Amino acid sequence: SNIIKQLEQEQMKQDVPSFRPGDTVEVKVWVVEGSKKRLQAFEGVVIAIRNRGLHSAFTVRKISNGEGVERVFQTHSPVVDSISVKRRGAVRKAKLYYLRERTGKAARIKERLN
Amino acid sequence: MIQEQTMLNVADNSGARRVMCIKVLGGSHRRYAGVGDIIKITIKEAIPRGKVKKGDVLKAVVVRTKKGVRRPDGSVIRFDGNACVLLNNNSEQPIGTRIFGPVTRELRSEKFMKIISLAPEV
Amino acid sequence: MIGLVGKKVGMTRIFTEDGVSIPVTVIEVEANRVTQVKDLANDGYRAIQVTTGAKKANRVTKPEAGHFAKAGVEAGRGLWEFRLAEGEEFTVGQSISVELFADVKKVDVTGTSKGKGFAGTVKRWNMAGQMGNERVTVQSLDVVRVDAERNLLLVKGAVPGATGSDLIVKPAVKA
Amino acid sequence: MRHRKSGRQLNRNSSHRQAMFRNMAGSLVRHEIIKTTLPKAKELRRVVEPLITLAKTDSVANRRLAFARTRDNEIVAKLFNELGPRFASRAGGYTRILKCGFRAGDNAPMAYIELVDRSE
RNA sequence: CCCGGCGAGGGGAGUGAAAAAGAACCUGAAACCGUGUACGUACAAGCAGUGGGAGCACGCUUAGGCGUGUGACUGCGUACC
RNA sequence: GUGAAGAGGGAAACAACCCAGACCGCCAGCUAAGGUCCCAAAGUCAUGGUUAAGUGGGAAACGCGGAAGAU
RNA sequence: CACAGGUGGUCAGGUAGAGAAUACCAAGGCGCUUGAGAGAACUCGGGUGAAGGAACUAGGCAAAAUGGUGCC
RNA sequence: GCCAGGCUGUCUCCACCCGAGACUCAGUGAAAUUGAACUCGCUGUGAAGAUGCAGUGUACCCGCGGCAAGAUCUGCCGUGGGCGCUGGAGAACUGAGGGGGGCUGCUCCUAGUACGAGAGGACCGGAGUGGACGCAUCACUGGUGUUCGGGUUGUCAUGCCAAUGGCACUGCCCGGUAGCUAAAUGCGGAAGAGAUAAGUGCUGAAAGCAUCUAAGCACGAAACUUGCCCCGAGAUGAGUUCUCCCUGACCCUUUAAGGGUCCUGAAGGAACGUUGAAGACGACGACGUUGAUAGGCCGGGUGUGUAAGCGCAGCGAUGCGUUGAGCUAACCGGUACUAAUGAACCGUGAGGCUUAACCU
């Protein structure tokens, strides 16, 4: 109702850019080490976007050491600092779960050129 | 999460390629084992020469889980498959000095202080 | 000590400064004014009757209207009782806000589980009988945020009852 | 189960139910009045009111969409010409249901469903 | 003649000794199914009866405590071949 | 001797345990076995003894103990 | 029994099809004699699914994976 | 005949979805069995496990769905109709009693501490964190989501192209709204209290020693019960508290917990509708014009993905701007536009006798 909508919206920051699915993106994450905190950069490709209010989370996949690791980043969580788009893609598909099997050239995507 | 009789990917230079689970420890009448739990696995394939021989039975620990684990902030770490590294009851220090793929931040256990150094890719 | 009756609205997550997500269930806590007071001399025990909400005059039975008129307050959607902790007493018409829970840090939630149809033996005990619509209590829950001016209460975990249901939040007896 | 779900079962094949509702809507549009069971009448109203609401706006895409769920060129032509302007002022509630007792054949409840204007 | 559906069936009138003889037709019982009448039963445990038995209605000697309809309670009572 | 082919009363129930052989009816009295706190009809009756453990109200051989009995 | 069963021969189109098998249509015949209801547990016939393909069962018995052309 | 490998809910654990039965409404409708039934548990006996014998205890009467310990009956869980709690009615609870479980590993400081020649080495059970059970929830992890969207093979149809709809398991797939879901996350095995075995004890003889006891007279095990929640006054012993309604008349008799007639019809309920995260049918919750109860509508959100048409390019497949567009069931805030009308029925008209205290 109104109360829950107000509670959800009062904790929203208008800083996340609008990135299409399958678009390469970098994420800055705060990580706690020892008694301090530091920044970590994670580059990947957005596969699925599920923007349920403040519960908005997007899955970002990366290839490291020859293995695929996918992590879900919360759109508005304090843990996520900033989102930057480096390489722009274009796929006519909301979800990119199909590429888990593709590799090399097949996994690559074409430039948007919008 | 890992269940009984599940294949685990090998993330060490011990030469192992395919390892099968036989028994699950870490709790009486336990049905599943997490990433930070000790499991019992065997070996299916071994290199022609090395310290690991076919048929050996020894402990191991999962470094990566297909299902993944959650985070206090709601984040979830999911991997393309299950990866496990063999461990020994005595001389816990695994032979492998190199680990395939990244690792999570839950390896801060008392006996896992020597593995965080490895796996440079996070 | 004394619990208050509220209305479940929903549940979501709350983000902490350190970067921790915590489940929170949302309870609207309207001012639960007291209508009648029970005492040892007359009623045999110490208790106070609390009412909340509003009922349309047409849909309010005349006996209830007379009872509330004697209480000198508008008719609510229900009446509830809470045993006193042998502390300071209250008076009829004394509105009670959520401030009481602003310094407890531990509360218990009682409510009716969501109804369900016939359940099999495996579904029940892992015999068949009705499921849900039964009083159930979950204890040792810590309040996260309190908003007196908004009648909003956030409590960790999950509580019995879906959206639109009525529940009771009481100070945690166990500690 | 049974919690916050829409659509009465009307035990039948899903495609069979869809065709049944298409026929019901076509008949109601053609004759502006039907004499059918209440359980079916409710979902008939729920499925037909969107059609008339869409028909209130005239456009090639709207006509194609109406024909997609109607499959009757004459019925589609009847739309956008008479019903659209007739109920232009009104927003929603384009149908009314009046009970007329229980069906004698099998004691099944039955009622009339007709447009608000229905004439003139 | 009327109700009924221009049916089946029923209700009047008439004939008929009689229609409590109507073609399902002399005489018409119990098992079985219904209404009404009078009584008992919803705190009360077992071959369901036998004696005691207040109470509940009718007619009687117009009371005089009589019979019929029921049996709350109570002692006893573990079917036939 | 009983049942077979004999009822009735007592032993809480019970066919072989005790008294006792029913012609029928009666709102009468007296007895056999068994009882006389109640349940249930009778003495909370008298005299002289044992009992402190509910042994009574289940138990042998053996030095009060032995003694452990059935949802 | 208007039963769910058996009953001998002939007539044998179009589309994509090696095919009279396969799926929809031509002429033709039918909606099969109880219908409608929120659609519970449970039974029967099926579909999807995270960690696995045999760790339940004496038992790969149901189900599920592939289902070809020429060459390196 | 055998081996190595891939391959599915056979399973850990099953979760969800689509159809026919299972339940109700209107009608047809037979069987096996049947001495009669007012068809309880326990103990003892019995031709020997007793619904029927002796003793004891519980249970209002009658229905609906299954679990099958013995689907007619006995028995269990849930839920209904009638009845009384004594004028009637609506709510809130005390509570005689009843359901159940009280499990368990690792680490931290305590602490390398007391004690102990040294070696050796805790009580601690205070904090954090696992395993198994139950309860709660869908925001998160996902599964389902044949009612939403898109890709695509064949065929038919809309007079034909384009564009659409049906069939082929939902035709085959890719995603997914809401609900349900565990593999996901919140909590619990309390603390404290009473009685406690062993054991630990202040003074203490009889019997100038001694002793848990003879006199005065104290703690205590994870064993047991409360403490923890849930049902519960059908607890017929039928409870306690609050509030509301009825304040008429007349006649007769077998003259009293009597009967009858006219008027009255209170509060409340049921009756019917919208219906629900309530439901097999009952029942329960919100509303019924003095309204957001259901449908539709507006806007948002989610999902899917660049709809058709238009003009350009490739003589064709197709792409380009229109267009992050079109559509969107179950989600959210409003909207009376539509459907819940005025009403009828039951439920009454001062509440039985006795006793004790009050003003009369």
GROMACS .gro file of N, CA and C (backbone and C1' of nucleotides) in nm, chain F residues 12-16 39 70-71, chain H residues 43-47 53-55:
model
  112
  624A        P    1  -1.580  -6.321   4.581
  624A      O5'    2  -1.715  -6.296   4.500
  624A      C5'    3  -1.821  -6.218   4.555
  624A      C4'    4  -1.858  -6.103   4.464
  624A      C3'    5  -1.889  -6.141   4.320
  624A      O3'    6  -2.023  -6.185   4.302
  624A      C1'    7  -1.737  -5.960   4.322
  625A        P    8  -2.053  -6.332   4.244
  625A      O5'    9  -2.014  -6.322   4.090
  625A      C5'   10  -2.085  -6.236   4.002
  625A      C4'   11  -2.028  -6.241   3.862
  625A      C3'   12  -2.020  -6.379   3.799
  625A      O3'   13  -2.143  -6.420   3.741
  625A      C1'   14  -1.813  -6.268   3.772
  626C        P   15  -2.229  -6.539   3.806
  626C      O5'   16  -2.150  -6.671   3.763
  626C      C5'   17  -2.142  -6.710   3.627
  626C      C4'   18  -2.027  -6.804   3.603
  626C      C3'   19  -2.034  -6.938   3.674
  626C      O3'   20  -2.115  -7.033   3.607
  626C      C1'   21  -1.819  -6.843   3.705
  627A        P   22  -2.213  -7.129   3.689
  627A      O5'   23  -2.249  -7.244   3.584
  627A      C5'   24  -2.331  -7.354   3.622
  627A      C4'   25  -2.257  -7.485   3.605
  627A      C3'   26  -2.138  -7.506   3.698
  627A      O3'   27  -2.177  -7.553   3.827
  627A      C1'   28  -2.074  -7.556   3.477
  628A        P   29  -2.079  -7.534   3.953
  628A      O5'   30  -2.005  -7.674   3.966
  628A      C5'   31  -2.079  -7.795   3.980
  628A      C4'   32  -1.992  -7.916   3.960
  628A      C3'   33  -1.861  -7.917   4.038
  628A      O3'   34  -1.876  -7.962   4.171
  628A      C1'   35  -1.820  -7.974   3.812
  651C        P   36  -2.586  -4.910   5.176
  651C      O5'   37  -2.515  -4.911   5.033
  651C      C5'   38  -2.509  -4.793   4.955
  651C      C4'   39  -2.414  -4.807   4.838
  651C      C3'   40  -2.444  -4.920   4.741
  651C      O3'   41  -2.547  -4.888   4.649
  651C      C1'   42  -2.214  -4.921   4.793
  682A        P   43   0.231  -5.622   3.896
  682A      O5'   44   0.223  -5.585   3.741
  682A      C5'   45   0.099  -5.588   3.672
  682A      C4'   46   0.108  -5.673   3.548
  682A      C3'   47  -0.017  -5.676   3.460
  682A      O3'   48  -0.027  -5.564   3.374
  682A      C1'   49   0.059  -5.897   3.496
  683U        P   50  -0.147  -5.459   3.391
  683U      O5'   51  -0.117  -5.348   3.281
  683U      C5'   52   0.007  -5.279   3.278
  683U      C4'   53   0.018  -5.190   3.157
  683U      C3'   54  -0.089  -5.082   3.145
  683U      O3'   55  -0.033  -4.965   3.085
  683U      C1'   56  -0.101  -5.224   2.957
  798U        P   57  -0.653  -5.412   3.058
  798U      O5'   58  -0.698  -5.446   3.207
  798U      C5'   59  -0.621  -5.404   3.318
  798U      C4'   60  -0.685  -5.442   3.449
  798U      C3'   61  -0.721  -5.589   3.466
  798U      O3'   62  -0.610  -5.669   3.503
  798U      C1'   63  -0.904  -5.456   3.532
  799G        P   64  -0.598  -5.820   3.451
  799G      O5'   65  -0.715  -5.897   3.526
  799G      C5'   66  -0.702  -5.937   3.661
  799G      C4'   67  -0.824  -6.011   3.710
  799G      C3'   68  -0.864  -6.134   3.629
  799G      O3'   69  -0.789  -6.249   3.662
  799G      C1'   70  -1.055  -6.000   3.671
  800U        P   71  -0.771  -6.367   3.555
  800U      O5'   72  -0.916  -6.432   3.543
  800U      C5'   73  -0.976  -6.496   3.655
  800U      C4'   74  -1.120  -6.534   3.626
  800U      C3'   75  -1.142  -6.623   3.505
  800U      O3'   76  -1.117  -6.760   3.531
  800U      C1'   77  -1.296  -6.444   3.501
  801G        P   78  -1.069  -6.858   3.413
  801G      O5'   79  -1.192  -6.860   3.312
  801G      C5'   80  -1.316  -6.919   3.349
  801G      C4'   81  -1.422  -6.896   3.244
  801G      C3'   82  -1.388  -6.944   3.104
  801G      O3'   83  -1.409  -7.083   3.087
  801G      C1'   84  -1.475  -6.725   3.093
  802A        P   85  -1.285  -7.181   3.060
  802A      O5'   86  -1.262  -7.174   2.903
  802A      C5'   87  -1.313  -7.275   2.817
  802A      C4'   88  -1.320  -7.228   2.673
  802A      C3'   89  -1.430  -7.128   2.643
  802A      O3'   90  -1.386  -7.036   2.543
  802A      C1'   91  -1.462  -7.321   2.511
  808C        P   92  -2.347  -5.764   3.065
  808C      O5'   93  -2.274  -5.885   3.139
  808C      C5'   94  -2.347  -5.995   3.189
  808C      C4'   95  -2.265  -6.077   3.285
  808C      C3'   96  -2.192  -5.998   3.393
  808C      O3'   97  -2.276  -5.966   3.503
  808C      C1'   98  -2.044  -6.153   3.295
  809A        P   99  -2.288  -5.814   3.555
  809A      O5'  100  -2.178  -5.803   3.670
  809A      C5'  101  -2.195  -5.868   3.795
  809A      C4'  102  -2.071  -5.859   3.879
  809A      C3'  103  -2.013  -5.719   3.895
  809A      O3'  104  -2.076  -5.643   3.996
  809A      C1'  105  -1.842  -5.866   3.829
  810G        P  106  -2.092  -5.484   3.980
  810G      O5'  107  -1.945  -5.428   4.000
  810G      C5'  108  -1.881  -5.435   4.127
  810G      C4'  109  -1.739  -5.384   4.120
  810G      C3'  110  -1.720  -5.244   4.063
  810G      O3'  111  -1.747  -5.142   4.158
  810G      C1'  112  -1.563  -5.391   3.964
   0.00000   0.00000   0.00000
